[PDB]
Design an enzyme around this catalytic site. Structure first.
Site, short mmCIF file in Angstrom:
data_model
loop_
_atom_site.label_atom_id
_atom_site.label_comp_id
_atom_site.label_asym_id
_atom_site.label_seq_id
_atom_site.Cartn_x
_atom_site.Cartn_y
_atom_site.Cartn_z
N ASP A 26 1.00 -1.28 0.01
CA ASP A 26 -0.11 0.07 -0.02
C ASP A 26 0.77 1.23 -0.10
OD1 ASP A 26 -1.78 2.15 0.69
OD2 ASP A 26 -3.24 0.64 1.25
N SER A 29 -7.11 4.36 -1.23
CA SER A 29 -6.95 2.78 -1.16
C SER A 29 -8.15 2.11 -1.69
CB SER A 29 -6.75 2.26 0.11
OG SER A 29 -5.32 2.74 0.40
N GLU A 33 -6.09 -8.53 24.76
CA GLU A 33 -4.63 -8.37 24.76
C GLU A 33 -4.32 -7.11 25.54
OE1 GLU A 33 -2.76 -8.35 20.96
OE2 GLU A 33 -0.76 -8.23 21.64
N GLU A 50 -4.76 -7.28 16.57
CA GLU A 50 -4.70 -5.76 17.19
C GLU A 50 -6.04 -5.53 17.24
OE1 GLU A 50 -1.85 -4.00 18.80
OE2 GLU A 50 -1.15 -5.96 18.69
N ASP A 71 2.77 -11.32 18.26
CA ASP A 71 2.48 -10.88 17.06
C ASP A 71 3.23 -11.55 15.85
OD1 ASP A 71 0.15 -8.67 17.11
OD2 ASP A 71 1.17 -8.65 18.75
N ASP A 75 2.34 2.44 3.33
CA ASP A 75 1.52 3.83 3.27
C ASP A 75 1.32 4.71 4.59
OD1 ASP A 75 -1.94 4.62 3.66
OD2 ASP A 75 -0.74 5.17 1.57
N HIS A 85 2.57 8.33 4.98
CA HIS A 85 1.75 9.60 5.64
C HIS A 85 2.23 10.18 6.83
CE1 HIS A 85 -1.63 9.12 2.81
NE2 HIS A 85 -1.73 7.83 3.24
N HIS A 112 -1.13 2.92 -5.18
CA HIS A 112 -0.93 4.37 -5.60
C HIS A 112 0.49 4.62 -4.94
CE1 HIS A 112 -1.65 5.15 -1.39
NE2 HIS A 112 -2.82 4.36 -1.57
CA LIG Z 1 -1.08 -8.10 19.40
MG LIG Z 2 -4.23 -0.60 2.31
ZN LIG Z 3 -3.12 3.09 -0.27
ZN LIG Z 4 -2.83 6.22 2.31
#
Ligand SMILES: [Ca+2]
Ligand SMILES: [Mg+2]
Ligand SMILES: [Zn+2]
Ligand SMILES: [Zn+2]
Ligand SMILES: *[C@@H]1O[C@H](CO)[C@@H](O[C@@H]2O[C@H](CO)[C@@H](O)[C@H](O)[C@H]2NC(C)=O)[C@H](O)[C@H]1NC(C)=O
Ligand SMILES: *[C@@H]1O[C@H](CO)[C@@H](O[C@@H]2O[C@H](CO)[C@@H](O)[C@H](O)[C@H]2NC(C)=O)[C@H](O)[C@H]1NC(C)=O
Ligand SMILES: *[C@@H]1O[C@H](CO)[C@@H](O[C@@H]2O[C@H](CO)[C@@H](O)[C@H](O)[C@H]2NC(C)=O)[C@H](O)[C@H]1NC(C)=O
Ligand SMILES: *[C@@H]1O[C@H](CO)[C@@H](O[C@@H]2O[C@H](CO)[C@@H](O)[C@H](O)[C@H]2NC(C)=O)[C@H](O)[C@H]1NC(C)=O
Ligand SMILES: O=[N+]([O-])c1ccc(O)cc1
Ligand SMILES: O=[N+]([O-])c1ccc(O)cc1
Ligand SMILES: O=[N+]([O-])c1ccc(O)cc1
Ligand SMILES: O=[N+]([O-])c1ccc(O)cc1
Ligand SMILES: [Ca+2]
Ligand SMILES: [Mg+2]
Ligand SMILES: [Zn+2]
Ligand SMILES: [Zn+2]
Lengths: 481, 481
Positions: B42, B92, B216, B270, B285, B316, B320, B358
């Site tokens: 992503d 997305s 958790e 999570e 995890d 992604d 960001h 993207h």
């Molecule tokens: Ca976890």
């Molecule tokens: Mg995604």
């Molecule tokens: Zn995305």
């Molecule tokens: Zn994004």
């Protein structure tokens, strides 16, 4: 704006069905390439390509991103890794060595292996690497260099020169020690290293002795000859070849390109680089597309084929100024030249590669609506409550602080051909970027252009397709008719 | 640093000769794909890929750019055009619709044609577009969704959901009018729309009623159930299937993935998104690579094959935040998962596509030396005489003015996992970018992945390769053994 036709899934399903049909139809040639063309978009990375696509799409009264560029129609695509041996983010000199000679070199050298060192003349000899174009000439093909920069600039120079210093345009640029050691300036190498049938672009000044008035700007001395050795390289070049013609303007280029008796053509259209297409005088100067056609008119005469280098050389320059309007308008003209060459040659016998030497820290973001100008504002304000542009740079000369803060921007402003998009870091010139660039390919052996390759692959696949050294035992059938 | 071996042209000539040999060996399959895998990075645009390559290369004590990623070894590459119908720079949700359902849609909608409108529930019906994964299930294949985000996030949701609003994670998010009109939250769609054999990632909270302690983080109420309809979607899902198991931690995932009696597996690790790999608790995890293997253990049991979606979903997110360290470390784990899947499946019967939804306005520039850290400073000062980083963003939360000017940066600072690279424009979150992304392909019918394609092509080529609707008349021979 949402195009009504695209609301229907059938539109997308039909297009994709058409795409699959076309993909299934692709077959590899069993035959060699008679002709080789490399179109080099200097600085034309992936973000430049998409942005140029949108701009060109809207030029023809469409929404933008859905309209293919001429280069988008090439069937075969690969990613090219552009690092120089010594630097992750490369220059044009050492990338030329890779895509033209098939060997990676060191930043700011040209046509030399990485055993050479920049600006050290005495590390030159033994490290010369011969270009595919040189090898095409040796095999009896006609060869052409066409660019919107000086013909002595790093990219075209990669086709013919070997130098530890890309800045050595004329003898005036070469230090005495390097001159004494036999390192020739690029303008001399242009006329001396190999026979070149067609040379079109800028760079008049480096060919003439100091004092020589430029024929087109005879009243601007900075445009005159640069040479200190008294040489007229144009006359020397003309004297070496019968059928040879020199032109400095569009009308004379036209006449020469149609003249059966012109076998060698040197057209140098500006003292230095050619003007940006948006500033071109269409009476005095040929566009890149026109120079491409002029080159093709002469090169196509040789029954053994040709090698042609065509550079969108000022795409790069537009990005350096952080003026995307210039970068992208150069890119569209580069694509027009690619389209024109495709109309004038056959993919049955012509291997055409479109690529870039490297990219730029140019990005296309914000969340603009479909059909909006590529030179427009992102919808919605930045965190500082001021507008921002969809096109931005990581670094470069568009970084501004007016009265202590990032300046606001309007649509009229962002849309000007002189507008510099903002960046994170002020630099006199925006930098190249190190990420992979595309290679597009069509014609015999184009299917070999695939996956993720070292940039050197471009030179090798071209040499292989034409059965040039070191692939004379290519095992391919003769080029198709 | 200049690697001595690269100074010799033979090094480059030998590599390119090897590359040509490999290129010539490529042949198209005549047979269908039994299995389909899409690996979705992503936000993993071209600049992310190259930067990640350099980082990973140095992870293994190499210089960087010369070492292939697992994805770099895929033979077939295409450029993908990512525009949504309504916006040039996509999200997305609507890109998922393209690469998973084969139809472009409008920004922030999922699994719907562009006749739908964002956040307008009453424009939903009739515009549902069925994913390739759904169609694979209908054909009797097992199907798997694996991501480091919430399993109800836009990308994985594209495999199963149809919604005018990507933000509708649980019923708590859906306005009363939309609930009344029958627009189901994504968590409900996850369990109700289709049978899914393997669901692995984050998003526990949306499955349980408000008041339900997260197993958790039972002491952090913000991590608890979100539902207002009293539903336990996990119990409802488990009740629908014999052989079904729910796990919320790595140890239980391990046990289930090896358990012959487990036919349906939901692992939600999570409350929301999974932690960045650099923050992952390796006792509690699973990494993306481990979840991929867990999915493969169960999916590979079905003799009719499988469809698997594997998302590097937080690449992604790193971008960001303008924290390239997070973007690129997520990318390397994504590449590790791609590598692992390749070790566990055969390209004789498995079509694997790696792509991005993207890109981001992420750039890699300056002129750093070979072997230098990707998180390092560009050699030489900016125009303001302060340092700058090789990695930059066009926009985003790394824009800083300390005391009226761009702050200086040190190597220790630039190298921190928490460091935000500078940008031209302050935004709380850096934006997506609209330029083409790569598609990498290997396996049966991968050769059809070529050129410059609409993003929808990804869904269509996968459906075609597996002879799924609308290509049941694919004309391919059965998958190879
Ligand atoms: Ca976890
Ligand atoms: Mg995604
Ligand atoms: Zn995305
Ligand atoms: Zn994004
Ligand atoms: C290229 O020429 C330079 C300039 O003379 C040489 O550099 C000198 O090398 C000696 C021996 O190592 C040093 O003591 C001097 O300090 C250097 N001078 C300068 C001006 O840098 C260099 O050795 C030559 N290289 C080759 C390949 O012959
Ligand atoms: C293009 O170049 C040609 C060739 O140099 C120019 O032709 C000359 O023009 C001058 C002034 O009109 C004449 O005195 C000569 O007869 C021409 N020389 C030759 C050798 O033909 C022409 O003027 C240039 N065109 C433009 C528009 O500047
Ligand atoms: C979806 O529902 C909305 C909300 O009721 C509808 O919007 C109304 O449409 C009427 C007729 O055009 C307008 O007079 C009102 O101003 C609208 N109300 C609101 C709150 O926006 C809309 O027409 C519905 N669309 C469909 C496809 O039925
Ligand atoms: C992983 O999940 C399992 C399953 O819920 C947890 O196992 C439970 O642990 C509690 C406390 O130790 C016990 O009272 C139960 O016997 C277990 N339940 C079941 C159904 O097995 C396990 O503790 C979790 N692992 C970690 C490290 O938290
Ligand atoms: O000496 N010079 O360089 C000159 C002289 C005359 C002229 O028109 C142009 C250049
Ligand atoms: O110089 N040329 O051969 C040309 C010039 C102009 C043109 O439109 C096409 C070709
Ligand atoms: O009411 N709640 O959301 C709770 C109550 C107890 C607990 O341990 C966690 C959450
Ligand atoms: O959960 N799993 O199936 C796993 C877990 C850990 C691992 O290293 C590989 C697979
Ligand atoms: Ca001119
Ligand atoms: Mg150039
Ligand atoms: Zn360049
Ligand atoms: Zn440049």
């Amino acid at each position: 704006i949402i195009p009504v036709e695209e609301e229907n899934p059938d539109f997308w399903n039909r297009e994709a069905a058409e795409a699959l049909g076309a993909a299934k139809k692709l077959q590899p040639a069993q035959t060699a390439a008679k002709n080789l063309i490399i179109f080099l978009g200097d600085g034309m990375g992936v973000s430049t390509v998409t942005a140029a696509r949108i701009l060109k799409g809207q030029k023809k009264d469409k929404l933008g991103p859905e309209i293919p560029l001429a280069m988008d129609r090439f069937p075969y695509v690969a990613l090219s890794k552009t690092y120089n041996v010594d630097k992750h983010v490369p220059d044009s000199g050492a990338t030329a060595t890779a895509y033209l000679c098939g060997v990676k070199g060191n930043f700011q050298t040209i046509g030399l292996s990485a055993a050479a060192r920049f600006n050290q003349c005495n590390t030159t000899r033994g490290n010369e690497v011969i270009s595919v174009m040189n090898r095409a000439k040796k095999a009896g093909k006609s060869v052409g260099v066409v660019t919107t920069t000086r013909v002595q600039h790093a990219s075209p120079a990669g086709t013919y020169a070997h130098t530890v210093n890309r800045n050595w345009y004329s003898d005036a640029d070469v230090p005495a020690s390097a001159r004494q050691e036999g390192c020739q300036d690029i303008a001399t190498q242009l006329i001396s290293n190999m026979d070149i049938d067609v040379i079109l672009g800028g760079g008049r000044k480096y060919m003439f002795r100091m004092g020589t008035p430029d024929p087109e700007y005879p009243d601007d001395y900075s445009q005159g000859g640069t040479r200190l050795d008294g040489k007229n390289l144009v006359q020397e070049w003309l004297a070496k070849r019968q059928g040879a013609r020199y032109v400095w303007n569009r009308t004379e280029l036209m006449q020469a390109s149609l003249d059966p008796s012109v076998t060698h053509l040197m057209g140098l259209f500006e003292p230095g680089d050619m003007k940006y297409e948006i500033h071109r005088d269409s009476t005095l100067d040929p566009s890149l597309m026109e120079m491409t056609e002029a080159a093709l008119r002469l090169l196509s005469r040789n029954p053994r084929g040709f090698f042609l280098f065509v550079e969108g050389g000022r795409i790069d320059h537009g990005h350096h100024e952080s003026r995307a309007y210039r970068a992208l308008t150069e890119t569209i003209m580069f694509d027009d030249a690619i389209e024109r060459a495709g109309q004038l040659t056959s993919e049955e016998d012509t291997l055409s590669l479109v690529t870039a030497d490297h990219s730029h820290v140019f990005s296309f973001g914000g969340y603009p609506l479909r059909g909006s100008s590529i030179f427009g504002l992102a919808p919605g304000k930045a965190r500082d409550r001021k507008a921002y542009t969809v096109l931005l740079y990581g670094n470069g000369p568009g970084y501004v602080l007016k009265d202590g803060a990032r300046p606001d921007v309007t649509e009229s402003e962002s849309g000007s051909p002189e507008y510099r998009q903002q960046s994170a870091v002020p630099l006199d010139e925006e930098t190249h970027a190190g990420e992979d660039v595309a290679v597009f390919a069509r014609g015999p052996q184009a299917h070999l252009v695939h996956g993720v390759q070292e940039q050197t692959f471009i030179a090798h696949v071209m040499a292989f397709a034409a059965c040039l050294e070191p692939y004379t035992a290519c095992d391919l059938a003769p080029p198709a008719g």
